[PDB]
Swiss-Prot record, chain A:
Pfam families (UniProt xref): Ribosomal_S7
Annotated protein name in UniProt: Small ribosomal subunit protein uS7
Species annotation: Candida albicans (strain SC5314 / ATCC MYA-2876) (Yeast)
GO biological process, one term: translation
One cellular component (GO) term of this entry: cytosolic small ribosomal subunit
Subcellular location: Cytoplasm
Record InterPro entries: Ribosomal_uS7, Ribosomal_uS7_CS, Ribosomal_uS7_dom, Ribosomal_uS7_dom_sf, Ribosomal_uS7_euk/arc
Taxonomic lineage of the native organism: Eukaryota, Fungi, Dikarya, Ascomycota, Saccharomycotina
GO molecular function, one term: mRNA binding
Key words, A-Z: Cytoplasm, Ribonucleoprotein, Ribosomal protein
Swiss-Prot record, chain C:
Gene Ontology MF term list: structural constituent of ribosome
Cell location: Cytoplasm
Protein name (database record): Small ribosomal subunit protein eS25
Residues of the full protein shown: 34 to 105 of 105
The family this protein is said to belong to: Belongs to the eukaryotic ribosomal protein eS25 family.
Encoding gene (name): RPS25B
Function of the protein: Component of the ribosome, a large ribonucleoprotein complex responsible for the synthesis of proteins in the cell. The small ribosomal subunit (SSU) binds messenger RNAs (mRNAs) and translates the encoded message by selecting cognate aminoacyl-transfer RNA (tRNA) molecules. The large subunit (LSU) contains the ribosomal catalytic site termed the peptidyl transferase center (PTC), which catalyzes the formation of peptide bonds, thereby polymerizing the amino acids delivered by tRNAs into a polypeptide chain.
Subunit structure: Component of the small ribosomal subunit. Mature ribosomes consist of a small (40S) and a large (60S) subunit. The 40S subunit contains about 32 different proteins and 1 molecule of RNA (18S). The 60S subunit contains 45 different proteins and 3 molecules of RNA (25S, 5.8S and 5S).
Native source species: Candida albicans (strain SC5314 / ATCC MYA-2876) (Yeast)
Upper taxonomic lineage: Eukaryota, Fungi, Dikarya, Ascomycota, Saccharomycotina
UniProtKB/Swiss-Prot annotation, chain G:
Subunit structure: Component of the small ribosomal subunit. Mature ribosomes consist of a small (40S) and a large (60S) subunit. The 40S subunit contains about 32 different proteins and 1 molecule of RNA (18S). The 60S subunit contains 45 different proteins and 3 molecules of RNA (25S, 5.8S and 5S).
Purpose: Component of the ribosome, a large ribonucleoprotein complex responsible for the synthesis of proteins in the cell. The small ribosomal subunit (SSU) binds messenger RNAs (mRNAs) and translates the encoded message by selecting cognate aminoacyl-transfer RNA (tRNA) molecules. The large subunit (LSU) contains the ribosomal catalytic site termed the peptidyl transferase center (PTC), which catalyzes the formation of peptide bonds, thereby polymerizing the amino acids delivered by tRNAs into a polypeptide chain.
Protein location: Cytoplasm
UniProt name for this protein: Small ribosomal subunit protein eS17
Cystine pairings recorded for this chain: none
Domain of life: Eukaryota
Family according to the record: Belongs to the eukaryotic ribosomal protein eS17 family.
Residues of the full protein shown: 2 to 69 of 137
From Swiss-Prot, chain J:
Post-translational modification: Phosphorylation by TORC1 upon nutrient replenishment inhibits STM1 and causes its release from dormant ribosomes.
Entry protein name: Ribosome-associated protein STM1
Function of the molecule: Ribosome preservation factor that protect a small pool of nontranslating, vacant ribosomes in cells under nutrient starvation conditions. Under nutrient-limiting conditions, cells reduce ribosome biogenesis and degrade ribosomes via autophagy (ribophagy) or proteasomal degradation. To avoid excessive degradation during starvation, STM1 binds to and protects 80S ribosomes from proteasomal degradation. Under nutrient-sufficient conditions, TORC1 phosphorylates and inhibits STM1 to prevent formation of dormant 80S ribosomes.
Entry's family note: Belongs to the STM1 family.
Biased composition (Basic and acidic residues): 28-42
Superkingdom per UniProt: Eukaryota
RNA sequence: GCGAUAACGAACGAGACCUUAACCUACUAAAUAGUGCUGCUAGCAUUUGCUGGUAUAGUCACUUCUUAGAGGGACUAUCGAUUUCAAGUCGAUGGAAGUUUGAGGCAAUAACAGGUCUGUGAUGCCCUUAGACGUUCUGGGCCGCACGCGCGCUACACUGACGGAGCCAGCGAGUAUAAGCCUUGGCCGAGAGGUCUGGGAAAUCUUGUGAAACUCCGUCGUGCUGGGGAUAGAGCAUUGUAAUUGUUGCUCUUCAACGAGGAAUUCCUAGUAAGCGCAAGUCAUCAGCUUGCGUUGAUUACGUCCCUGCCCUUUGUACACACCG
């Protein structure tokens, strides 16, 4: 708690990071828990990070993606549609602003809302196709926890992307509305219509 | 006394390093202070042509190379001593230029 | 071509802004445009003054994004 | 002279050479304080080697790094590696090795790239395409 | 491929 | 402690030196500042017509402070950007020479610069004195 | 995959049939030993041969191996 | 400039000498089989590890053909082809 | 800061026989007048002491007449010759800047002046083809 | 209209009134020799 | 009424394109009633993947 | 490769190999690389400090970064699972590196009516050979425009446009009495560009190639709008003997379709794809092209034979010029 005097002065807020590592020095991982037993091992929130930008090697082995921080997996999916590939700093800026908007709204922990939106967005049964060389055939199969998690991130960012297209509303606050709505399970949000529509068709194939 | 620079250039390093070491050797038993050899950054002369003399087939390219290795040696000796060192270490591949 | 957002501030909208913006959980450039029907440029100048008048607390400052909240 | 250790950190092409001397808590980037390293959003990447161990470790040492090459992001990762490696290298030489093994534990337990340079380099381009693996679009 | 015919 | 130019953020130091350099008023502003484009790659003149020349001179002074005998051709490269060639790909094009050359000439007779040996323009004996002063009066607030 | 070839599999088992008493279960010792027993043209092949000889030695200590 | 002429020590080991010698035989009308085997056996007699002669073209036929006349051991891929 | 006004805003302006939307910013509202681009409109507003932070309808008549005066007489207000639309005119050799209705008239007069002498460029204008040497084999499909 | 320059300004481009052809592709036993001069076994026997 | 079933054995890749996997699941509660089921995403052992309906076995996919 | 085995033991190809990238505070040195000290010197606080400049004589020190030669290092190393307990595979730990460590170069036995005689003073034959199908000079064409198609570049916007400010690479190339190379610095010019000197035959100078995306602060405010920049007019320069059918560059003006694209179809598994620029080649001039290089940097498998091609085995054959039979 003591303030440490250096020759190069260090700001007060960053010296507070010595006590705890927090996302953007604002959000704590301590009070965050996954409200689903089946996705605990594939939503990685145990290792805190300061900024959702680690430049790690998560594409080498098969399940290394489960070790990437969940916010970094979310900011990775934002930079899509060609003109945004490789623009991670822009993606981190969007996530950083989105969390603040998620904080002033509903007052919850922003990264808790992120975790809630991910457990509620992954379809639990998807109808794979079993077409015999061209003919249309569908069979209902279960969805693995890893694909369940990473389809939630794919659907959450796709919905936020399309809501901000040709709209005065900015992407950071389109993502905040998309994440908040999916966290509370509202069917108004995209990626909850899709999740319901996936599990609805799967019910008509088993 | 004379500050004298010897520049060594060649395409192949085996003869270049022999001449380089041989000059350093003669500058050791002769109590001549020396600076070097200095391994200059090697130059990769690259030429990329098309394999086909005509223009038919898959677009395949050759990539020829010609590495040039350069060593400079600084000597503090009279001009008669340094020049005769060059004739001691004459090699067909390596060319020698002596500059004061 | 349906937007037709107001860019000139009359008197009816001015006091409506100071009576309605305080009763907002979260205000921004788009929130002002979306619900007050004013233009984006008029929204940006409204936010920079409403903060100076104390009605609005700046949660976060950025050129591309302005996150503001009520000061009450 | 005095207690001085000199190290370096690397990313893709960026290389940051850190000089760690005995002194006060002076931490400079190309002669400029670290509190204003750009880009701002990645400023905590270089704060990680500081706040992980506690700024008290830097009372007796001053650090001046010179980072050249690479890019904007690649230079930030080079700096944070040079600081973390510089602090460890100073402890190994002028402090007991028990603390150096202590410092190396927190750094490694948080991020491997703090001490170990990432070995990834750009794949060479091959003819027949605009990239390393990418090929010109084929038509029938 | 052509037969050169003169005019002058 | 001794505040220097390197101890203050660049973006808000230039905003402070531009304000001081304009209010001081001794910098001579050429008559075409309301007409010209900064670079041939630009498509519009600066939006801050009254103050853009002062801020650019402040940027030039600070940029020269941190280096040694930078010329005016290098300044064209520094402030140049990507040109908006219509259908052809983008390209780097240098900024206008006169604007940079006028700035360094204006700064050289106000006392901040001088002709350096072996080319370029060094910062003056007084150039360090008044920039380091502005740096101190920049970060106390 | 990491399937060793025949030029390394048969050359390594010739070492065991010829220098078993001098061999050991340590790759580092085997690597130095095979540099004085065989004339290997390249260092990479030397490490591959010594690395498979160690594996065979480690397997002989667990029971009899077929073909050696 | 000074030019010296030196005899090649091992004529069987020089492909240039063997190709020029073979050409001087083919232009004399000797049959290809008798000519090709004259260098195949000459190369091996000199101690070559291997030798291969390929003659391609047209010979008394409108259609062209190629015939390879190998001998001994030959390596094909990798660096050693640049060495041996 | 936000300020209010009543009855002073003018929704539709009419300058040089062109209708100007009054809620557009002045620098870009004047670009509706043919012959006035963003670069030119940016300068006449600075020569007329009309600050660019005003919408088109915000301007008073006194400012509007001061702008149309400058656009029609650029050289008289220290506007450089090289900045003008029609410099070194064909007939009288003076520097001009043609505007809304004059532009298509003098654009036309250039076409017949090319066609009257039956130059190659004038001929291709008659045919409706590209005149600046562009290939028409595969892109002239409109 | 003897000179081509004078006539060009009087000839109209009547191109948008006629329709393009529906198809325009205008650019086969490679194995069977067409030389008509077969090679006898004696010629191959004498040569090779 | 969703039921959770830990996977205990990865049988093998099934389906026409190999995009679906046969797996051996074990229920979290009542550690019995072991069932063979098909899963779309990548699967390791010890995945707590939940089942919308339990009373159904699985066989090879066409 | 293990293994099964009328086969046993081998050769070519694969793999080994070679070049390149990643590690080395372990050797060898470096005024054409860098640093710390030291002279001399500047600014700010005065705490002795912090940023600089200078030093081919301070006739210092060193090799960490930089360069390159001699080596070392990885062989799936150790430990768990599975397996015929074999070849192997999957997990961890250590490690710079554990996908053949990453990428290429080379690359078998025969062969194709594959492509080139429009690269060759490489070639057989046929044609022409003085009013030439030889060679040269002048001008035009290869660009020509109702149309179908392919390789690409710009875009359809706010994850953006402008306007200022921040300000980071790597691969390379470079001349003389030429027929003119890379060209800084100063001075003019809105620009393009012009002019005067100097450096560099090169780790020395161009050049830290201060590249672009990128980041910050402002204007714009969902509008075919400040998105987009075709089409066209006028003018100013550059290269060249010569710019007209605009070589190219710059200024003003003109403000088109396009508001994310049908049936189909391409490339791709990690520093990869995708963006983003830069150099070299062609080159008097012209790069929306290739050959490379670096910046930012992901999503998703790590599986299968469902489509497609090829390979193998069995099988039928009246084919062997081999189904174009």
């Amino acid at each position: 708690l003591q303030v440490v005097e250096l020759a190069t002065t260090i700001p007060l807020d960053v010296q507070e990071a010595q006590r705890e590592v927090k996302l953007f020095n604002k959000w704590s991982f301590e009070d965050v828990e996954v409200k689903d037993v089946s996705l605990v091992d594939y939503i990685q929130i145990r290792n805190p990070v300061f900024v959702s930008h680690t430049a790690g090697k998560y594409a080498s082995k098969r399940f290394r993606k489960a070790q990437c921080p969940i916010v970094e997996r979310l900011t990775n999916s934002l930079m899509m549609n060609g003109r945004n590939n490789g623009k991670k700093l822009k993606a981190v800026r969007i996530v950083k602003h989105a969390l603040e908007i998620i904080h002033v709204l509903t007052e919850q922990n922003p990264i808790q809302v992120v975790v809630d939106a991910i457990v509620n967005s992954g379809a639990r049964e998807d109808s794979t196709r079993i077409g015999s060389s061209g003919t249309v055939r569908r069979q209902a199969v279960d969805v693995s926890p890893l694909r369940r998690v990473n389809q939630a991130i794919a659907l959450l960012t796709i919905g936020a992307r399309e809501a901000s297209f040709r709209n005065i509303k900015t992407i950071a606050e389109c993502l905040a509305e998309e994440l908040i709505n999916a966290a509370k399970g509202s069917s108004t949000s995209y990626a909850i219509k899709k999740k319901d529509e996936l599990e609805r068709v799967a019910k008509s194939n088993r | 006394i004379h500050k004298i620079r010897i520049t060594l250039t060649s395409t192949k390093v085996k003869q270049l390093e022999n001449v380089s070491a041989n000059i350093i050797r003669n500058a050791a038993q002769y109590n001549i202070v020396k600076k070097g050899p200095v391994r200059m950054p090697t130059k990769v002369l690259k030429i990329t042509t098309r394999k086909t003399p005509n223009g038919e087939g898959s677009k395949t390219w050759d990539a020829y190379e010609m590495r040039i290795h350069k060593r400079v040696i600084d000597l503090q000796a009279p001009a008669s001593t340094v020049k005769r060192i060059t004739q001691i270490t004459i090699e067909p591949g390596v060319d020698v230029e002596v500059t004061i | 071509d349906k937007a037709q957002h107001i860019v000139i501030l009359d008197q009816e909208k001015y006091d409506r802004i100071l009576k309605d913006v305080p009763t907002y959980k979260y205000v921004s450039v788009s929130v002002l445009v979306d619900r007050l029907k004013i233009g984006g440029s008029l929204a940006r100048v409204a936010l920079r003054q409403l903060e100076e008048d104390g009605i609005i607390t700046p949660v976060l400052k950025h050129s591309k994004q302005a996150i503001y909240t009520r000061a009450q | 002279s005095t207690q001085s250790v000199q190290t370096f950190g690397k990313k893709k092409t960026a290389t940051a050479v850190a000089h760690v001397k005995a002194g006060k808590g002076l931490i400079k980037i190309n002669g400029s304080p670290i509190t204003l390293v750009q880009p701002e959003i990645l400023r905590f990447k270089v704060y990680e080697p500081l706040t992980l161990v506690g700024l008290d470790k830097f009372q007796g040492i001053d650090i001046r790094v010179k980072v050249t090459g690479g890019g904007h992001v690649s230079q930030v990762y080079a700096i944070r590696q040079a600081i973390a490696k510089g602090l460890v290298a100073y402890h190994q030489k002028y402090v007991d090795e028990a603390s150096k093994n202590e410092l190396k534990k927190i750094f490694a337990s948080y991020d491997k790239t703090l001490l170990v340079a990432d070995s990834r380099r750009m794949e060479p381009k091959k003819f027949g395409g605009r990239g390393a693996r990418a090929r010109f679009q084929k038509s029938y | 491929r052509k037969k050169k015919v003169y005019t002058t | 402690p001794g505040v220097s130019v390197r101890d203050v953020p660049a973006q808000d130091f230039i905003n402070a030196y531009a304000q001081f350099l304009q209010r001081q008023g001794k910098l001579e502003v050429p008559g075409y500042v309301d007409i010209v484009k900064t670079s041939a790659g630009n498509d519009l003149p600066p939006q801050e017509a009254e103050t853009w020349f002062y801020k650019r001179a402040a940027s030039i002074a600070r940029h020269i402070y941190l280096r040694k005998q930078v010329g005016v051709g290098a300044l064209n490269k520094l402030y140049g950007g990507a040109k908006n060639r219509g259908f052809r790909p983008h390209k780097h094009v240098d900024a206008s020479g006169s604007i940079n050359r006028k700035c360094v000439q204006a700064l050289q007779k106000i006392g901040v610069l001088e002709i350096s040996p072996k080319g370029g323009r060094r910062i003056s004996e007084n150039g360090q004195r008044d920039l380091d002063r502005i740096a101190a009066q920049t970060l106390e607030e | 995959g990491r399937v060793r070839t025949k030029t390394v599999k048969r050359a390594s088992k010739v070492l065991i049939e010829r220098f078993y008493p001098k061999l050991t279960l340590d790759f580092e010792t085997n690597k130095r030993l095979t540099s004085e027993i065989a004339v290997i043209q390249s260092k990479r092949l030397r490490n591959k041969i010594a690395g498979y000889t160690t594996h065979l030695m480690k397997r002989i200590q667990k029971g009899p191996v077929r073909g050696i | 400039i000074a030019i010296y002429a030196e005899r090649v020590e091992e004529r069987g080991l020089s492909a240039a000498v063997q190709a020029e010698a073979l050409k001087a035989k083919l232009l004399s009308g000797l049959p290809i089989r008798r000519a090709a085997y004259g260098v195949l056996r000459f190369a091996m007699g000199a101690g070559a590890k291997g030798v291969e002669v390929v003659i391609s073209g047209k010979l008394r036929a409108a259609r062209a053909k190629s015939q390879k006349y190998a001998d001994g051991f030959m390596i094909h891929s990798g660096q050693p082809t640049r060495d041996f | 800061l936000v300020v209010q006004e009543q009855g002073s805003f003018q929704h539709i302006l009419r300058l040089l026989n062109t209708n100007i939307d009054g809620r557009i910013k002045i620098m870009y509202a004047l670009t509706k007048i043919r012959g006035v681009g963003r670069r030119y409109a940016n300068l006449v507003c600075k020569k007329a002491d009309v600050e660019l932070t005003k919408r088109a309808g915000e301007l008073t008549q006194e400012e509007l007449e001061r702008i149309v005066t400058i656009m029609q007489n650029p050289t008289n207000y220290k506007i450089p010759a090289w900045f003008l639309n029609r410099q070194k005119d064909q007939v009288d050799g003076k520097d001009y800047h043609v505007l809304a209705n004059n532009l298509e008239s003098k654009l036309r007069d250039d076409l017949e002046r090319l066609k009257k002498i039956r130059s190659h460029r004038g001929i291709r204008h008659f045919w409706g083809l590209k005149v600046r040497g562009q290939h028409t084999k595969t892109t002239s499909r409109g | 209209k003897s000179p081509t320059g004078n006539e060009a300004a009087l000839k109209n481009k009547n191109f948008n009134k006629d329709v393009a052809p529906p198809q325009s592709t205008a650019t086969p036993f490679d194995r069977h020799s067409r030389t008509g001069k077969t090679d006898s076994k004696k010629k191959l026997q004498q040569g090779w | 009424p969703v039921t959770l079933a830990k996977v205990i054995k990865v049988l093998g890749r099934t389906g026409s394109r190999g995009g679906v996997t046969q797996v051996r699941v074990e229920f979290l509660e009542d550690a019995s009633r072991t069932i063979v089921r098909n899963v779309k995403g990548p699967v390791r052992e010890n995945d707590i993947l939940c089942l919308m309906e339990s009373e159904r076995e699985a066989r090879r996919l066409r």
